[PDB]
Design a protein around this ligand. Sequence first.
Ligand code: HEM
Ligand code: HEM
Ligand code: HEM
Ligand code: HEM
Lengths: 139, 139, 146, 146
Amino acid sequence: VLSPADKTNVKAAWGKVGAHAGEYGAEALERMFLSFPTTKTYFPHFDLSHGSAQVKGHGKKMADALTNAVAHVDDMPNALSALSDLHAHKLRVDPVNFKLLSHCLLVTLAAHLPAEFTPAVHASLDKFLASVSTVLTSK
Amino acid sequence: VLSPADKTNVKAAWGKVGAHAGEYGAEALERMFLSFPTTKTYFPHFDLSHGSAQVKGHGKKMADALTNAVAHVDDMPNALSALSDLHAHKLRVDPVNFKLLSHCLLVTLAAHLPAEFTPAVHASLDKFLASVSTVLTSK
Amino acid sequence: VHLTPEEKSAVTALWGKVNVDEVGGEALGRLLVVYPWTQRFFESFGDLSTPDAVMGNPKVKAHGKKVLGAFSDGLAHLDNLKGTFATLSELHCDKLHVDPENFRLLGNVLVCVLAHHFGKEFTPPVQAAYQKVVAGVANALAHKYH
Amino acid sequence: VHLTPEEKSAVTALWGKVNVDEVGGEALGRLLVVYPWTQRFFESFGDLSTPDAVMGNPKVKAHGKKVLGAFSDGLAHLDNLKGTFATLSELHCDKLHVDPENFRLLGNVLVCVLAHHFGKEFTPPVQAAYQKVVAGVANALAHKYH
Ligand code: HEM
Ligand code: HEM
Ligand code: HEM
Ligand code: HEM
């Protein structure tokens, strides 16, 4: 499960994410695309290069789903239910990719929140992202 | 989640496991020990060689916890709660090892139940074992 | 990858006994069934909506034949898997974009298939030698990713 | 592993800027904190009951130094990681019994550490080149497992 300290860490770290929410999810995706090129096949219609509004807008959609999970952290399967079907049924996203994206998110968080990315928060964000991934590959 | 068809598959496949329950879990462990020798460090006090009563008895304990999960398949986290703490807190079993053991279990099931190990049951047993593993590494 | 004489023995023997015409289909099939995201790469094979459909699919059995040959191949060059699979690496890496973790999943589905069809014969040491092989193929196959 | 001139450039430059005396401790530390089963291998280091304790542990900072050197080493031999890590392979494989997946986890914790400490500088292409490196070290380090 997520510990209460996990919950407070995440709510806190994401609390200082702020309006950058969209910007960050876009940068996570770019980081993933560059670092793990296999992941680009799921976006063979997006523009994936730097400055892409295609990545940025989806980066926003993704970060808003995260923020939604942060708010309903105790009922994440119900919250992320519709995205579970999306990714597993229709899109057929390989579960490996969740790990790759999760790592790039941490990297992106570590790079924008020097003070908040402590070991303990790091460990919380990891448990959190692993949890989201689990719901998204649940179906 | 586990589908209802998942549930009926598993209850069925495990239903024909029978008194061999202990025998099988012991053989899964041997298969794991031989195939993935790193996993032996968690048993540096057991006798791990063939014919070992040490492996066999634990093989039984493990298979009985599985059978317990099969019965409470809808409330597995509550059911497997005490083993979650055991493996994650005190024993510190690397989550990778659950995947290795799970695969050896399937192999052991496939080898003793020619008729029951259909693709669909295979897929169910996999989802099931992955679920058990998730509870056991939850803490 | 280094197999021992006995491991080579265990492997080469049981492999001879393999129906090289159906085992590949059965392995590919269970991959598509057990790990449904893999279907993504095979949408051109048509009807894959139930396991029965997937298994009874000629394109799967057909392609499974080819996969099995590749393993049989790599079995010849246990000494040199890296070079054998060099071709297949580039294809899977550069054109298909299949995550290499899937190679390991196919290898283990194959081990299960062998277990199922050979039962008792597929002893734990026999399984061990085979894990060395499928791991080796996977890594060789994953080298143009490295 | 083949880095490009620019990737070599990106890497070698930012690496020069690395405080080779603390980064390793911080990476090892977060490994022990983020992935608690890894502690199992380090029970001889004493107090590891909170993250504060783990990070403030001299044996961790000490050992982290050694890990960082090994990366710095492998950085010299990007052309030959396999041979460099040959020693370290046997040890981790035959004596320690550490699952190689953990090598990948350490590599990514290192990437996070770099990200944290370098912020903006750690651009996505910079991160990319570094992923090539830590992957390469992990596989080289995992070769006596293969
Ligand atoms: C943190 C994990 C993830 C979250 C929260 C997430 C969230 C979302 C959301 C909310 C959408 C709907 C976007 C929209 O309707 O405009 C979406 C779509 C999509 N996601 Fe994810 N996703 C995640 C992981 C992944 C991964 C790992 C991949 C592939 C490597 C992926 C690939 C896609 C694709 C291809 C779409 C279709 C978008 C479109 O058609 O415009 N997602 N995701
Ligand atoms: C299917 C997953 C697993 C199940 C259901 C399971 C079940 C159990 C149970 C019921 C016990 C208590 C035995 C007793 O009290 O006599 C136990 C202990 C133990 N398990 Fe597991 N286990 C699983 C996975 C693993 C894995 C993957 C490892 C290591 C690679 C492992 C290592 C151990 C160890 C070292 C003990 C201590 C036994 C003793 O001290 O006698 N377990 N397990
Ligand atoms: C694990 C060991 C594997 C081996 C030894 C192997 C081998 C092969 C072989 C021999 C072919 C025939 C190509 C040709 O002759 O034209 C092939 C093609 C193909 N492979 Fe695999 N493969 C493996 C794993 C996978 C996996 C896990 C996937 C997807 C999840 C995959 C996806 C494909 C696809 C879609 C093709 C046909 C594409 C085309 O013809 O353009 N392979 N592979
Ligand atoms: C990922 C890249 C890694 C590198 C480059 C690396 C490198 C090293 C080095 C340089 C040493 C010093 C040995 C000596 O000089 O005596 C060492 C020892 C050690 N390593 Fe690692 N290591 C890595 C990963 C890991 C991981 C993930 C674990 C455990 C989870 C681990 C467990 C240990 C332990 C317990 C020792 C000390 C044991 C002894 O001294 O007998 N290593 N490693």
